[PDB]
Each structure stands twice: as C-alpha cells, then as structure tokens.
C-alpha cells in the first residue's frame, strides 16, 4: 500500500528562507536581534502556508488554527533550524538562515549564548540519534499540535483526534525493525527528543518577551506580527494559561 501521509509532508516542507541580514554591519546586539525578528516574521508566513496544507488541519476551528500557530511557532522554528544546522554545518554553528549563521562571537553578542548552546545540543541530537528525514518531518508536524490552552480549544475533540493521528503516523515510520525492543526504544528516544524542545522554546519565549518590553531602549525592531504575538499570546504561556503537551512527566 503506497504511503500518502509522508508524500504530503515532504511535498509541503518549506524551502530556504533568508533573514535579509546585512552581513556588512558589525555584529551588534541590535543588528542581530532585529534580523532574527525579521526572520521570525518571514518564517511565520511559511509556517502558516505550511500548516494550512497539513492533513486535517483545516478541519479545525479557524480560531484554533490561529491559536496552535501562535503558540507553537517558536518550537517549530527551533526544531527546523536545528535540523538545518545539523545537515549544513554538522551542528557546529546555528544555521538560522543562509545570510544569518551564528558563530561563537554572534552567540555572545546576541546576549543569548546559553539558549544558543541548548539549541546546538538539540541540533546535535539529530546526529546522535541518526534521525531520518522522515522521522524529522513527522516530529515537526507533531510539534504544531504540542501546545494548547489549559482551558482547551474551541474544538478540543477534533484536535485530540488529529493529534492522536499524527502520533500514529510517527509510530509508523520510526526507523527500526524482528526486534520489537529496538522499535520500543526508538519511540522512547523520539518522544524524549520532542519533549526537550519545550524547555528551549520557553527560554526563548521569556527572552523575546523581555526584549520586546525594552525594545525601544535597546533599539531592537519587532515586525508587526511578531510584536502582536509576543505581547498577546506569549504572555499566556508565561502566565501558565497555555501549556505544552509532554509525552513524559
């Protein structure tokens, strides 16, 4: 039986996105963070177009569609950037975009060196675990469905069924074989990898929120869409109204 789910994921996977960073200016806090915010804005456009093409996604209430996107973009973009870093520079640097690659100096200058280190460990996991492109696509799709309000969504029922289905699809393409233990071990590793994305996203969420607050004082520009989500949705996560869905406790 010819697969379909994976055909779709591979087909809709977003292409290359540039930050628009001018690599001629010195590496300053203001210049680096302003370019990261622009990349986030451009990437948010692809995240939306991508999500809309995902199987079952349009069957969610429009407001729930907005919500999962507003809540999970950080995790999605970090996971993807870790994959690019792993495949383009063997996780040696953070490959945010072709025109915005962070080396050690930029990690320090960004004032988020610790968070960059944690992102680099994430990227390296793709190597340590030997994550296949298929496993990567399925895990990334599941991240879209990994954060919701504690009060639930407008149509929680359908969301829970869609989430379930994306889990079964992940289970189906895990790299294993005559050895049920290997498959069991593999699923454990992948669920653990997905969970580890959340604490990273949370640090970045805290950082960007604080940055937005003092943006005028540190000369960091926030595009319209990022400004809006960072000032309305991100606080709901930081205040505990919206929480990640973990596999493990």
């Amino acid at each position: 039986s010819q697969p379909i789910f994976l055909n779709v994921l591979e087909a809709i996977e977003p292409g290359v996105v540039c930050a628009g960073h001018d690599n001629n200016q010195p590496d300053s806090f203001a210049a680096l963070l302003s370019s990261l915010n622009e990349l986030g804005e451009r990437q948010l456009v692809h995240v939306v177009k991508w999500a809309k093409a995902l199987p079952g996604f349009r069957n969610l209430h429009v407001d729930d569609q907005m919500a999962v996107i507003q809540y999970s973009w950080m995790g999605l973009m970090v996971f993807a950037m870790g994959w690019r870093s792993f495949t383009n520079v063997n996780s040696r640097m953070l490959y945010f975009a072709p025109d915005l690659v962070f080396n050690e100096y930029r990690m320090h200058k960004s004032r988020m060196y610790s968070q960059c280190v944690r992102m680099r460990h994430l990227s390296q996991e793709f190597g340590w675990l030997q994550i296949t492109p298929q496993e990567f696509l399925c895990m990334k799709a599941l991240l879209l469905f990994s954060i919701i309000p504690v009060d639930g969504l407008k149509n929680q029922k359908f969301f829970d069924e869609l989430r379930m289905n994306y889990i079964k699809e992940l289970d189906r393409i895990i790299a294993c074989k005559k050895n049920p233990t290997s498959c069991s071990r593999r699923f454990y590793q992948l669920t653990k990898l997905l969970d580890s994305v959340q604490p990273i996203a949370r640090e970045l969420h805290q950082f960007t929120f604080d940055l937005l607050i003092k943006s005028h004082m540190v000369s960091v520009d926030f595009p319209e869409m990022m400004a809006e989500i960072i000032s309305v949705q991100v606080p709901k996560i930081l205040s505990g109204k919206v929480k990640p869905i973990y596999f493990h406790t």
Binding site: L44, V45, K52, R58, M66, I69, Q70, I229, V232
Partner: peptide, 12 residues
C-alpha cells in the same frame, strides 16, 4: 492578529 488571519484566509 489581523495580519495572521489574512495569511490563513487568502487562498484555501
């Protein structure tokens, strides 16, 4: 979130 809504509505 007007801009986000527009990106979702446009083409579907």
């Amino acid at each position: 979130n007007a801009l986000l809504r527009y990106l979702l509505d446009r083409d579907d």
